[PDB]
Amino acid sequence: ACLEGCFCPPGLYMDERGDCVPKAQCPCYYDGEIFQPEDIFSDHHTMCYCEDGFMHCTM
Amino acid sequence: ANSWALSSGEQWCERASPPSSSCNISSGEMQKGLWEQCQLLKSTSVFARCHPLVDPEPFVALCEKTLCECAGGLECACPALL
Prior knowledge:
The structure is cut from a larger assembly and holds two copies of chain A.
Chain A: E1 13-14, E2 20-21, E3 28-30, E4 33-35, E5 47-50, E6 55-58
Antiparallel strand pairs in A: 1-2, 3-4, 5-6
């Protein structure tokens, strides 16, 4: 619904530490694991990175 | 291409983003009259003889996406042609 509470402006998104930040340093939550805004990351076969909040995986 | 990045101490660098093309709204006449300068890789006789050695199909493919950001010029085709 259209709820009531404490938000921050649309350019800013909520971070875990109470502050809210733009989507540049908004971490990724792949498989529960909290990855930093720039984390290149790969097993042998898969290839994954965190750009701006989303986790871009490939194969 | 972003796997083969190499940083230094003066500057550490991040993943570049693909550019958001402004061509998608400023289409207009720019694709009608300027389709020919890409096309003359295939039509003109001076280029009509490397076809058994190479294929111009990628070259014409890569030009048509860059004839759209420059305003008012046929010269925008000669880089991909050169």
